[PDB]
Design a protein around this nucleic acid. Structure first.
Ligand code: MG
Ligand code: MG
Ligand code: MG
Ligand code: MG
Ligand code: MG
Ligand code: MG
Ligand code: MG
Ligand code: MG
Ligand code: MG
Ligand code: MG
Ligand code: MG
Ligand code: MG
Lengths: 213, 159, 61, 293, 170
RNA sequence: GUCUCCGUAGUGUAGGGUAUCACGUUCGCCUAACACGCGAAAGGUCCUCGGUUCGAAACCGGGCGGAAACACCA
RNA sequence: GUUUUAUCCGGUAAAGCGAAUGAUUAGAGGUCUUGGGGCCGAAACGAUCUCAACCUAUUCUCAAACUUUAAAUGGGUAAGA
RNA sequence: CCUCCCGUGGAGCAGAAGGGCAAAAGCUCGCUUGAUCUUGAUUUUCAGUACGAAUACAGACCGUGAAAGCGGGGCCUCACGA
RNA sequence: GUCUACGGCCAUACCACCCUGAACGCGCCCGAUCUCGUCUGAUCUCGGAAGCUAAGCAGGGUCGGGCCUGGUUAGUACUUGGAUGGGAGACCGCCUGGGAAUACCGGGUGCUGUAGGCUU
């Protein structure tokens, strides 16, 4: 009962979040955004590969769910269930509406046509810009081709054009891979979970002397 | 379909700036407004009495009448294809002096001083301010340094 | 049945055909709306300006 | 810690401090706006207020008008300059408040040159008195009381200072409801117990009351009264001749002092180089302590 | 060695009797407090209406009175005599003041009267130092400062040296 | 689709300040026994959520259902 | 129906959410509780293993009816007898 | 219920929402009727007509406060009729 | 070099903790006969001057938080005007002018008016 995605491909309206004004929104198709070994430490998965949209368009929650499932299945098949971590970087926050018409052989049956045409919430989509990351996969450095293939397969679930880019950052952090090692060595970075905490050279000296100890 | 309320659309216009709520500083009350001087109408929202209408916020007028707490201002308002000089009573919280007028009177006084001084000392001097002239000819020394060669950088996708 | 509701199309052109003229700034504005107490004292000062004319002309001379 | 830290970073980011004197708890700006702001159709006409501030050991009486750059004080009188003549002990009481208000009034009138006119009420009684401007002569000085944060109940020393000033010849609008002679039940002003308070007879009664019950308690309470032998019988005459001296010479002369060496009693602010060096030394010492282990 | 301006002392004692309902019982409890303190108490109304306790909003529920000075010292002495000079470790608040409860008001000084019940009550003594009134003054009010504050350890120490009591670890 | 109404013991229903009636259920009587009858008892987020109120089953909005009435001229 | 020089006015675009108000992803570190509990702990969970809630520092993604910050274009006034 | 501490307002201000507000505009007391009698001017919608509402004055008579002052209804934006 | 009274701007002034404070002062402090308020002289009001800088207060400190001001972000984002520019579109590039904001990295941490004191 869902319309084709070509009817909601473009970012034509203003953002329409589920709020205290827009009520009765059905739940989004995608509820899980992180898959694989999410508890893996930062140094475990040094390689990061992003999938980046080249179009300013709307991606539906069902499309995000399908792409996530496809990428997960290929990554589990190739690199094993604990050899990767995936993060979907798009959340379907924009509600798309439908002005429902009666699909019967009658316009006299209170169809009203375009009168009071403001629609009911049909679904949720995510707005993506040119250069915005849709999915990210971090894994071992030797699984680069597997990451590229998984993202290539996931591309087929989306309307527009997407590029696969192997980032220079270390894992899901915002720091370059070449500088990551010596930054951790000189304790500008402290690992925790899947991320690193940047430790600037300002603040109380008690925080400095709990380090170097 | 728009309402005709007196304060429709003034949600941010009459709101206070960030971290500037509370007591109105008293120099605003201590300002002196004579008849004929030029004031800017702003319209702070802490004081709800004597508030100007939203169409006069940001406008500038001339004081014609002074009362205990407010002033009477002749301010131009454009209505369709005509401009008419409205007279509004505005409490002194919502107005301030016009530095454009202040600078102009300073310039007039300084020009009169220059006229008197130059008539005393004979030599003619320029008083009409000119627009920015074209740049005159000048020499640019290299100081024995070759100017740096610039080239466009190669493209790479960053993020 | 239905028709156009509102527009300001062509209105600016109509406004500028005869020009949007500012009010005629002319010397000696009217004293309308001025504080009545101030106005009545001003009237008294104008009325009694007559006396002191001999002193005024003596100072002028 | 299991409760949200209320004073976190965002709390200070959005915190708006009050005015400095409001934070110091010295100025009531709600009362100040009504008290110091002149009507706009009066233009640059000054609005005079008589600030009265009773301190733990002093009374300060000032006359000021507000300006944009700050208050302009035209006349100040203090209770610590009372020992110059007559009264020297038992300051910061109602009688000293009357004396310093009278001194402020006489000093201001002398500076403005209005002494033969507006002599005020020379013969002190507690009854109400309001100076009237004399035609063909400069008008009486008009100012309004500034009590600050003091609770203005009946018998306040700020109203004692106001009574002193209005007896000195200052036109201050007031009523007798807050003078000590006022009876809150019958709504009637006695004007005699008020004069007793002005002459300090309540303190004299306390002295002679303590004498007849507990002599050592009297010593402890009026210890400095014993010095130079201030006694209840002569207290009223002392206050009367203090008033007479105020009327005779209200002019204040300043005290000169210039032979003072420039000595600094406060530590100066450290420099950025010094702070950086201190941080470096602390780091080096900590690493040294570790390597010693 | 120790500045005399830092000496701990009792600020107020704050007797409280929370009768469940209003009327004759509350009046008798007020009479109990007035006879104990030589001082008129005041009535406290219910903030909200709860059906479990059977009280209504703005209904006079409890009675209480704050006692300061030598009278506070004597009343605290009587209360600690009833408590046998022992207090639990948790009876002391982290702000440096403490309290306890007395089950029957007639075991401390006051004799029984047939028109008087068997009311219990709450003692809550507030400790202070010379200078705590700056937080309560009107003009130029301010906070007391970190070193001038009273800690739970300081309150327990003061209890031990003054009223030679026992701090039970409970 | 639009408009209107309803939701309360197991059942059918009444009803801003601790929820009624009848049947049903349990217990004890009467009878050889059952039924009738007699004497007692128990049994209900008052559909769900939020709000006004000191206090909501009630008053006001949203949702779950259920029930009616319209759904015409070509 | 113009620019320039002064001088005010504004809350859109953008940006922000380790800034308020709402929405929201995932780990990490702590220690109280009517969290589940937990394998040998009833015996003083002799113990301390996990999952909760909570707090703390981070982290992904957002807002027409959110916002610290904030354009371009624009609106007013002045540039003298 | 009583006590202390933190608390930039995360409460309250009749109601919709927005703005505004902390020795406030909120809460509690005390005294009161400026929610009174009048003439004009002005703002808002605007045709620069009216109504409604509102702002600043001026003249009386008052209320309150020690006083400066504030008050001719409700903190402002609605609550009405030839 | 500072303080007190009254302030102007209203954090470069706030917040947390620590150290120092000579002299005046400001305070803490002592008491309830009178004035005046309380459940309570705690607050308020009043009368004082034994003690104390413990606190307020002032100055300084913290690889402090905040705030203020810079750099970077970045001529990036966005944008006035133009084209018979590109592209199926979505959008993008160029010409003509204007031009931001986080994160990150520095510096600073009240200025001052009137009146009156102290500081050899
Ligand atoms: Mg089809
Ligand atoms: Mg649309
Ligand atoms: Mg058509
Ligand atoms: Mg038409
Ligand atoms: Mg006051
Ligand atoms: Mg807007
Ligand atoms: Mg935007
Ligand atoms: Mg946020
Ligand atoms: Mg009047
Ligand atoms: Mg009003
Ligand atoms: Mg810092
Ligand atoms: Mg451009």
């Amino acid at each position: 009962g869902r319309r084709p995605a070509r009817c909601y491909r473009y970012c034509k309206n203003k953002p329409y979040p589920k709020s205290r004004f827009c009520r009765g929104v059905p739940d989004a198709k995608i509820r899980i955004f992180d898959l694989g070994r999410k508890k893996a430490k930062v140094d475990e998965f040094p390689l990061g590969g992003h999938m980046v949209s080249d179009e300013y368009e709307q991606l539906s929650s069902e499309a995000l769910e399908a792409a996530r499932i496809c990428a997960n299945k290929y990554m589990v098949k190739s690199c094993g269930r604990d050899g990767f971590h995936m993060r979907v970087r798009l959340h379907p926050f924009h509600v798309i509406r439908i002005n429902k018409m009666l699909s019967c052989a009658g316009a006299d049956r209170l169809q009203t046509g375009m009168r009071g045409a403001f629609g009911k919430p049909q679904g949720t989509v995510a707005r993506v810009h040119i250069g915005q990351v849709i999915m990210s996969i971090r894994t071992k450095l030797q699984n680069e081709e597997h990451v590229i293939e998984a993202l290539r397969r996931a591309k087929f679930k989306f309307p527009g054009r997407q590029k696969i880019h192997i980032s220079k950052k270390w894992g899901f952090t915002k720091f370059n891979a070449d500088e990551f090692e010596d930054m951790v060595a000189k304790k500008c970075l402290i690992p925790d979970g899947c991320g690193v905490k940047y430790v600037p050279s300002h603040g109380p000296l008690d925080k400095w002397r709990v380090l170097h100890s | 379909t728009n309402t005709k309320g007196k304060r429709r659309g003034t949600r941010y216009m009459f709101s206070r700036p960030f971290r500037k709520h509370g007591v109105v500083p008293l120099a605003t009350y201590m300002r002196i407004y004579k008849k004929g001087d030029i004031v800017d109408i702003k319209g702070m929202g802490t004081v709800q009495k004597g508030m100007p209408h939203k169409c006069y916020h940001g406008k500038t007028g001339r004081v014609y009448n002074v009362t205990q707490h407010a002033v009477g201002i002749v301010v131009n308002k454009q209505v369709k294809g005509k401009i008419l000089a409205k007279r509004i009573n505005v409490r002194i919280e919502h107005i301030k002096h016009s530095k454009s007028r202040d600078s102009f009177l300073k310039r007039v006084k300084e020009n009169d001083q220059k006229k008197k001084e130059a008539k005393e000392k004979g030599t003619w001097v320029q008083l009409k301010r000119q627009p920015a002239p074209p740049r005159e000819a000048h020499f640019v020394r290299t100081n024995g340094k070759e100017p740096e060669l610039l080239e466009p950088i190669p493209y790479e996708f960053m993020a | 049945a239905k028709s156009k509701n509102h527009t300001t199309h062509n209105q600016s052109r109509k406004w500028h055909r005869n020009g949007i003229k500012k009010p005629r700034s002319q010397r000696y504005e009217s004293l309308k709306g001025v504080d009545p107490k101030f106005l009545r004292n001003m009237r008294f000062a104008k009325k009694h300006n007559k006396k002191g004319l001999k002193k005024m002309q003596a100072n002028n001379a | 810690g299991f409760v949200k830290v209320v004073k976190n970073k965002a709390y200070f980011k959005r915190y708006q401090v009050k005015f400095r004197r409001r934070r110091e708890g010295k100025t009531d700006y709600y009362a100040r706006k009504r008290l110091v702001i002149q009507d706009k159709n009066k233009y640059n006409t000054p609005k005079y207020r008589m600030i009265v501030r009773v301190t733990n050991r002093d009374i300060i009486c000032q006359i000021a008008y507000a300006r944009i750059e700050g208050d302009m004080i035209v006349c100040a009188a203090y209770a610590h300059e009372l020992p110059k003549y007559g009264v020297k002990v038992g300051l910061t009481n109602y009688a000293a408040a009357y004396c310093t208000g009278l001194l402020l009034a006489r000093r201001l009138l002398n500076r403005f040159g209005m002494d033969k006119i507006y002599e005020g009420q020379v013969e002190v009684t507690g009854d109400e008195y309001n100076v009237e401007s004399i035609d063909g002569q400069p008008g009486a000085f008009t100012c309004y009381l500034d009590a600050g944060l003091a609770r203005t109940t009946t018998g306040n020393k700020v109203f004692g200072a106001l009574k002193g000033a209005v007896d000195g010849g200052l036109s201050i609008p007031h009523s007798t409801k807050r003078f000590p002679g006022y009876d809150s039940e019958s709504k009637e002003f006695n004007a005699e117990v008020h004069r007793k308070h002005i002459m300090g007879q309540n303190v004299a009664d306390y002295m002679r009351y303590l004498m007849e019950e507990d002599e050592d308690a009297y010593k402890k309470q009026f210890s400095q009264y014993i010095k130079n032998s201030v006694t209840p019988d002569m207290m009223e005459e002392m206050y009367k001749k203090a008033h007479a001296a105020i009327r005779e010479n209200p002019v204040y002369e300043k005290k000169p002092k210039k032979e003072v060496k420039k000595k600094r009693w406060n530590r100066p602010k450290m420099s950025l180089a010094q702070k950086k060096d201190r941080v470096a030394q602390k780091k080096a010492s900590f690493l040294r302590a570790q390597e010693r282990a | 060695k120790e500045n005399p301006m830092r000496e701990l002392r009792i600020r107020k004692l704050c007797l409280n009797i929370c009768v469940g309902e209003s009327g004759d019982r509350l009046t008798r409890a007020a009479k109990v407090l007035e006879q104990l303190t030589g001082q008129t108490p005041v009535f406290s109304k219910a903030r909200y209406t709860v059906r479990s306790f059977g009280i209504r909003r703005n209904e006079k529920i409890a009675v209480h009175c704050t006692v300061r000075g030598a009278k506070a010292e004597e009343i605290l002495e009587k209360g600690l005599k009833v408590r046998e000079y022992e207090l639990r470790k948790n009876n002391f608040s982290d702000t440096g003041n403490f309290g306890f409860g007395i089950q029957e008001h007639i075991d401390l000084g006051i004799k029984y009267d047939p028109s008087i019940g068997i009311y219990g009550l709450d003692f809550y003594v507030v400790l202070g130092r010379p200078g705590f009134s700056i937080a309560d003054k009107k003009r130029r009010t301010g906070c007391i400062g970190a070193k001038h504050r009273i800690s739970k350890e300081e309150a327990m120490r003061w209890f031990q040296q003054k009223y030679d009591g026992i701090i039970l670890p409970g």
